[PDB]
Design a binder for this molecule. Structure first.
Ligand SMILES: [Mg+2]
Ligand SMILES: [Mg+2]
Ligand SMILES: [Mg+2]
Ligand SMILES: [Mg+2]
Ligand SMILES: [Mg+2]
Ligand SMILES: [Mg+2]
Ligand SMILES: [Mg+2]
Ligand SMILES: [Mg+2]
Ligand SMILES: [Mg+2]
Ligand SMILES: [Mg+2]
Ligand SMILES: [Mg+2]
Ligand SMILES: [Mg+2]
Ligand SMILES: [Mg+2]
Ligand SMILES: [Mg+2]
Ligand SMILES: [Mg+2]
Ligand SMILES: [Mg+2]
Ligand SMILES: [Mg+2]
Ligand SMILES: [Mg+2]
Ligand SMILES: [Mg+2]
Ligand SMILES: [Mg+2]
Ligand SMILES: [Mg+2]
Ligand SMILES: [Mg+2]
Ligand SMILES: [Mg+2]
Ligand SMILES: [Mg+2]
Ligand SMILES: [Mg+2]
Ligand SMILES: [Mg+2]
Ligand SMILES: [Mg+2]
Ligand SMILES: [Mg+2]
Ligand SMILES: [Mg+2]
Ligand SMILES: [Mg+2]
Ligand SMILES: [Mg+2]
Ligand SMILES: [Mg+2]
Ligand SMILES: [Mg+2]
Ligand SMILES: [Mg+2]
Ligand SMILES: [Mg+2]
Ligand SMILES: [Mg+2]
Ligand SMILES: [Mg+2]
Ligand SMILES: [Mg+2]
Ligand SMILES: [Mg+2]
Ligand SMILES: [Mg+2]
Ligand SMILES: [Mg+2]
Ligand SMILES: [Mg+2]
Ligand SMILES: [Mg+2]
Ligand SMILES: [Mg+2]
Ligand SMILES: [Mg+2]
Lengths: 125, 188, 155, 260
RNA sequence: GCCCGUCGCUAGUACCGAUUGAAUGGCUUAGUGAGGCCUCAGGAUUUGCUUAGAGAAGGGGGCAACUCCAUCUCAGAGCGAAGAAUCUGGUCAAACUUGGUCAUUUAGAGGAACUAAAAGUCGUAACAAGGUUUCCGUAGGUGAACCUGCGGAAGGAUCAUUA
RNA sequence: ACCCACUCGGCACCUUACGAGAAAUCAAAGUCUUUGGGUUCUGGGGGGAGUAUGGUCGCAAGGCUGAAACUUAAAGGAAUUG
RNA sequence: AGGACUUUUACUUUGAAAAAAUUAGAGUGUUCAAAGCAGGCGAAAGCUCGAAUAUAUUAGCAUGGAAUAAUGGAAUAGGACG
RNA sequence: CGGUAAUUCCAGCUCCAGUAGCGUAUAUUAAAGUUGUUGCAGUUAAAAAGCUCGUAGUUGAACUUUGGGUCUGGUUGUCCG
RNA sequence: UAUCUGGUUGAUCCUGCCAGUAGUCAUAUGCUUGUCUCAAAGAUUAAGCCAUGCAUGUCUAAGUAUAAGCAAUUUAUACAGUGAAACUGCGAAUGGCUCAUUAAAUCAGUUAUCGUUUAUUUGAUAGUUCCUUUACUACAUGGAUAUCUGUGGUAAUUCUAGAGCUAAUACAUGCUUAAAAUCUCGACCCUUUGGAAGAGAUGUAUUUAUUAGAUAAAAAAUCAAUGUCUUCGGACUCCUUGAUGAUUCAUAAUAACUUUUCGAAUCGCAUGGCCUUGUGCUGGCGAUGGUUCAUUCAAAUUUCUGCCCUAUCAACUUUCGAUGGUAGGAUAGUGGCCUACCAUGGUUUCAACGGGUAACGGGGAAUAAGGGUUCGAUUCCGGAGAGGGAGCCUGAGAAACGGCUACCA
């Protein structure tokens, strides 16, 4: 018997599987950024939800509290290092305002498309 | 195989505990020594962690101590006259701890004679001066003189022949003897 | 519930290895050995000058007090040389955030130096296993009566 | 289990040996020795992991066998020797000397320490008793039984074994206002001064400790090891001197002292 | 319009159930009780101390108490020491026989049912004042729903007689 | 004995919603998503079923306690128009 | 640092404790990630920061508080002090 | 849904959802404010014992120093150095 | 990660469930299946039964070498190299697997052992083994015994009987070896303050009695006992005592006791120094042992609190231990753990006792507004078990089962 290393899920399928507006939005996001499946949007939404649970938990805590300072500025520095959160809004209250499209935008796919060396999103893929 | 664990006993409430963890080796209990008198025969038993134990069945002679002047002598056990737990051992002459036995009592007698010389039951100048400095302080009580005249001393064993293998004890003396002789007169 | 005779049973009752010399002419009562259990617990003078024996006395016997110290109320003083103490407490059920009155019955061994009766609150201390169920020795009778200190009414 | 246990699974090893939870089913169980295995440190862990002088078990065995390791002036050729707190590990090759003292994160840190002071060791007094024929003796935390000690050396005290003859060189008396180390619990590695020692009649003495940064905590007396007088430690304290900087302060240290 | 019950047919479910059933397991009265352990004995054999008299041929390194020698060797006899089989009493007690008891499965003639299936039959109780208002408790009766008696209740078909 | 005014307690009653309810309606069935005064009993779809079994009470009648197997997509409450 | 008396709780703050793995969570380009406790930097001539923290809501131990909730004093004075 | 025009059965075409995964069965969790301590209902929908007394359990009126003045220590927002 | 929708009706508002929905380190199964990393995996019913093969043996320069095994060459008159086999020593009680039994049982957190055993590891630890010492092996005491050489038996098994040698850190014995001091017993004298030639025992280990193991603080008189010095008034001034919260603790002392434990008759390397120049005197680094006390790995018990459903289980337990007392036995040790004699007690509506668990406990998993519900056979910690039962040898540690004995299947 050897110590296990923990596998863990990275997405969460939505509750209502046949929401028309939600399905159309998911197809819009898949076609805009050349996503292979709709599991990609689920994964980005799950990452956003984890970040957001952390953000709201830190918000609940009192201002000028060591936990608030340490973990809040850690999360903000990580997100601005990723690039999704602009340097203007390093406040931990705009961190709740991030949308799934923001993390979609920082994908290497969309970055290669932006730089211009790939003239199409599917070409970037 | 004789266990001494608490599982087989009922709970304090009274429920019958179900069987669990068939009894171990660190819970064992061995047979009683139920020692006797005569023809010294001590059997070694190898207990937990070495530590040789000695069963002392059939033991005839042992050390006995006198508390008043505090002197110990090897002497013979001659029968058991009272046992505080079960008179059955007395009838069977089984010798265990706290039993009351009779003593040949001679070694104490001539130790007294060479020590004070009061001629119970009825020289160099150094010994004479020792006795003079003593100045008859040996005013030991009357009942011990009574069984000295009888010749057999009343002693209570204090060693555990079942475990140690020895047969050591001390003579009844003072109110001790008093108590037990009343009990003996109850037997008489 | 205590016999007038200082030894009543068939075996003699002595404190082991404390010896009074009969050949000596001091003629004091006896040589009674005692100790203090510590923790700032006062040995009772009834044990100090008493004549009982009680092998399992925290103050005069071989047993030593160490470990838990429990305060309870006497629920049964009417079995020989031992006491049954009711310890009440509140178990906290968290699913309701509510407490639950509960009680346990702790057997113990009260020395003859103490005069106990039903209803006395008692401080008791841990010791060696004395019997199958008793593991505590009564160390203090805090409330001797509680509400029976004054009984009569004669103005 | 019927009898002693001779295997230590990797997850069951103390989190201060702080091995890799993968790459092995078991962990080095320290053999019986001068220290509790929960508190000690096997030589294989100290060499293969802490020092990386070796690579695996065979290399550690070859190192120990040729008598290059010297624990407290003795060879100790067994792989899982429990080299515990304050022991001295000498390697004549690289002429290096280590003394095991917890870094404030609470771990057996590699402390390279000078040869001159490596001649001696410090120890906590755990018992003062009278052995046969009326000879007084003192038992330290290593289990060293030092015969004929100073008559006013008491329990919980500290002493300075010369580690060559193994006798009594000097000692420090436990009392308030004295530099002290912590050897267990949340306050591992912390160094301070004894402000008060509340007695607590009946057991489990506690002492309050205030360090140089003027922070205060409280620890059990079993968990305490007097190390010297304030401003004058009797040993060479490790880097950081066990101040226990806050996590935010540690982040500020990472940011400030930074060059790449 | 809607629906009530008896009897009639089919499939399933469950129950009772004489058979004084059957199996398993649990305990357990009573009677046996392997084997180990302890103990009482016992004493094949192995041995050591002994002078216990021989042949040995300096079976001492001086025909002889060898100027004996861990000398050849058994009748010795004693004293030990170890000591197998066997064996006295316990003790732990597996397990066997015998009944008793309980629990679960297990059949089982026959009996009383309940469902679903609704195009059988006899009536038409209820829903309207259901054409005898309804319903409840209790008792009797009868192919069947139901009827009747005595107390209630409106969920009544009256919130109302100072007309 | 009435008449007028007031007060305590009781069976009650009229109006009203400014409150509550699915409403019929309730001055309590209010002070309940702005949810906590104390406290006891009961119900978790309908049927099987207040049946069987096991207790317990009873002379008896029967009372108290009291399921499941199985079946079913409804049964039921108030009110609106015919 | 010693004798001395200690009303006792319930409650609540803080701390020591509640093994590692797991959950949370800091750092870290495993090519990203699940993960892992790694790694990073020299001129390439040995120099290095790490392996963070928190929570467990019960039982026990210590500690500060005295509202809320409970018990006990002095009524025969056998009460408190000198 | 299927009774001679089947958007529901068997097929062809088109399309939809997830996608190297998807479909079923049982179990279980959220949905379940359908277990309700937070947080359920009892007039008629299921549900207030026929009523009263009563041990245990649960709960239980108010009251016992509240004020002030000064000095002084940290933490803030102050105005600016 | 605070959400609802279809269905009772001609139609409505409800109560209500059915159904839908999304999970699931929850499996099974169906249809498909290209890659990299990663990985569960005969738990559910049957802790049902097992062929076959492995799963524990071990040698360093340092316990024993005469393999009639190998090397016989640069190291070789006892032996040295390598090394089968066997004796010796040690482990085999770790690990691995399963969850059958078990509902204050295990287990978790928290205590205790001033209530006990503990191979090993680590640190210390002993002159006395003399017993009348003016006659002994201490320059080394004895006998077996495997391996082996040969004879067999049985159909076979890790079956071994007879004969012949042979060894030890195996089994037995046993020697030095000081001094000192303390206890005891006296060939005498000289009138007290009596004080002295001299003789035996005392290491440790065991057992039992007794003593010391103190301690709040300044002075007295007196009587007796009677000790030192007396500069003959009398002064007595000096008394040593460790630890905890507590002890009869640690320890010391006296008397004794033992079918008398230990106190090195053991190995490797280097073999130096002194010259008393001989095999003489000494002499280093280790390896194994070895008594006791510690320390460590532990092991046993042990305090408080915490467990799922059930009253269609309300009283349960005690002649056969049920609660307590005492003494004894046994235990490593406390303990009705067992026995003898006494007392009649202990638990319970705060759910005892009984029944059920398709129940091993826990760390944890799924699920997620908050509160919770369900699961936890399994990677870690504990417990239990080896077909069901009992019994036991060896050891420090087993009621072991890849150890034995017996019954049942
Ligand atoms: Mg194991
Ligand atoms: Mg049918
Ligand atoms: Mg027999
Ligand atoms: Mg008709
Ligand atoms: Mg009709
Ligand atoms: Mg009509
Ligand atoms: Mg009609
Ligand atoms: Mg009609
Ligand atoms: Mg129903
Ligand atoms: Mg009904
Ligand atoms: Mg009936
Ligand atoms: Mg209607
Ligand atoms: Mg943890
Ligand atoms: Mg994570
Ligand atoms: Mg068509
Ligand atoms: Mg409801
Ligand atoms: Mg109705
Ligand atoms: Mg109704
Ligand atoms: Mg009612
Ligand atoms: Mg009441
Ligand atoms: Mg009040
Ligand atoms: Mg919810
Ligand atoms: Mg309807
Ligand atoms: Mg319709
Ligand atoms: Mg559903
Ligand atoms: Mg490839
Ligand atoms: Mg299985
Ligand atoms: Mg072997
Ligand atoms: Mg060799
Ligand atoms: Mg049970
Ligand atoms: Mg004493
Ligand atoms: Mg002692
Ligand atoms: Mg006893
Ligand atoms: Mg089970
Ligand atoms: Mg488990
Ligand atoms: Mg479980
Ligand atoms: Mg199972
Ligand atoms: Mg396990
Ligand atoms: Mg086992
Ligand atoms: Mg099997
Ligand atoms: Mg062994
Ligand atoms: Mg077995
Ligand atoms: Mg096997
Ligand atoms: Mg095994
Ligand atoms: Mg075998």
């Amino acid at each position: 018997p050897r110590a296990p290393r923990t596998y863990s899920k990275t997405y969460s399928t939505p509750k209502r599987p046949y929401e028309s507006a939600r399905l159309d939005a998911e197809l819009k996001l898949a076609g805009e950024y050349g996503l292979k499946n709709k599991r990609e949007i689920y994964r980005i939404s799950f990452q956003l939800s984890k970040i957001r649970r952390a953000a709201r938990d830190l918000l609940t805590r009192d201002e000028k509290d060591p936990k608030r300072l340490f973990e809040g500025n850690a999360l903000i520095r990580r997100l601005v290092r990723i690039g999704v959160l602009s340097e203007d809004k390093k406040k931990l209250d705009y961190v709740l305002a991030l949308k799934v499209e923001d993390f979609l935008e920082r994908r290497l796919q969309t970055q290669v498309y932006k730089l211009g060396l790939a003239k199409s999103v599917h070409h970037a893929r | 195989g004789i266990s001494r664990d608490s599982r087989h006993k009922r709970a304090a409430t009274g429920a019958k505990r179900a069987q669990f963890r068939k009894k171990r080796k660190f819970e064992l209990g061995r047979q009683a020594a139920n020692t006797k008198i005569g023809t010294k025969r001590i059997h070694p038993v190898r207990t937990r962690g070495g530590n040789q134990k000695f069963r002392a069945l059939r033991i005839e002679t042992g050390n006995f101590s006198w508390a008043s002047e505090g002197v110990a002598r090897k002497t013979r056990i001659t029968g058991v006259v009272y046992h505080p737990s079960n008179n059955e051992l007395v009838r069977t002459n089984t010798l265990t701890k706290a039993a009351i036995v009779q003593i040949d009592a001679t070694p104490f007698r001539q130790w007294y004679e060479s020590h004070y010389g009061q001629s119970l039951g009825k020289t160099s100048k150094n010994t004479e001066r020792k006795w003079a400095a003593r100045a008859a302080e040996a005013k030991i009580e009357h009942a011990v003189d009574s069984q000295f005249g009888a010749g057999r001393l009343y002693a209570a064993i204090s060693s555990r022949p079942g475990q140690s293998g020895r047969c050591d004890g001390y003579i009844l003396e003072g109110e001790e003897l008093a108590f037990y002789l009343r009990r003996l007169t109850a037997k008489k | 519930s205590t016999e007038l005779t200082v030894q009543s049973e068939r075996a003699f009752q002595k404190q082991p290895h404390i010896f009074t010399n009969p050949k000596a002419k001091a003629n004091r009562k006896t040589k009674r050995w005692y100790k203090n259990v510590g923790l700032g617990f006062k040995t009772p003078k009834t044990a100090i000058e008493g004549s009982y024996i009680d092998k399992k006395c925290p103050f005069t016997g071989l047993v030593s007090i160490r470990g838990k110290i429990l305060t309870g109320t006497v629920v049964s003083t009417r079995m020989h040389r031992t006491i049954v103490i009711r310890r009440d407490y509140l178990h906290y059920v968290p699913k309701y955030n509510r407490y639950e009155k509960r009680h346990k019955n702790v057997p113990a061994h009260v020395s003859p130096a103490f005069r106990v009766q039903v209803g006395d609150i008692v401080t008791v201390g841990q010791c060696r296993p004395i019997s199958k169920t008793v593991r505590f020795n009564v160390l203090k009778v805090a409330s001797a009566t509680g509400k029976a200190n004054k009984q009569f009414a004669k103005f | 289990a019927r009898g002693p246990k001779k295997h230590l699974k990797r997850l069951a090893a103390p989190h201060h040996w702080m091995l890799d939870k993968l790459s092995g089913c078991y962990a080095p169980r320290p053999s019986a020795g001068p220290h509790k295995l929960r508190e000690s440190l096997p030589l294989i862990v100290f060499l293969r992991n802490r020092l990386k002088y070796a690579l695996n078990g065979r290399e550690v065995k070859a190192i120990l066998m040729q008598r290059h390791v010297k624990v407290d002036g003795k060879v100790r050729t067994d792989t899982t020797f429990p080299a515990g707190f304050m022991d001295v590990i000498t390697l004549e090759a690289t002429n290096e000397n280590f003394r095991l003292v917890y870094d404030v994160k609470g771990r057996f840190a590699v402390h390279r320490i000078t040869d001159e002071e490596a001649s001696y060791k410090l120890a906590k007094v755990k018992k003062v008793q009278l052995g046969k024929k009326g000879i007084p003796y003192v038992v330290t935390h290593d289990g060293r039984t030092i015969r004929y000690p100073d008559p006013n050396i008491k329990v919980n005290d500290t002493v300075k074994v010369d580690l060559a003859t193994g006798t009594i060189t000097d000692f420090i008396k436990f009392d308030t206002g004295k530099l002290v180390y912590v050897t267990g619990g949340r306050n591992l590695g912390r160094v301070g001064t004894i402000v008060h020692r509340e007695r607590h009649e009946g057991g489990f003495d506690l002492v309050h400790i205030k360090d140089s940064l003027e922070n205060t905590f409280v620890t059990r007396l079993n968990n305490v090891f007097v190390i010297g007088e304030p401003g004058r430690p009797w040993i060479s304290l490790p880097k950081g001197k066990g101040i226990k900087l806050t996590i935010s302060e540690e982040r500020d240290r990472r940011r400030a002292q930074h060059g790449l």
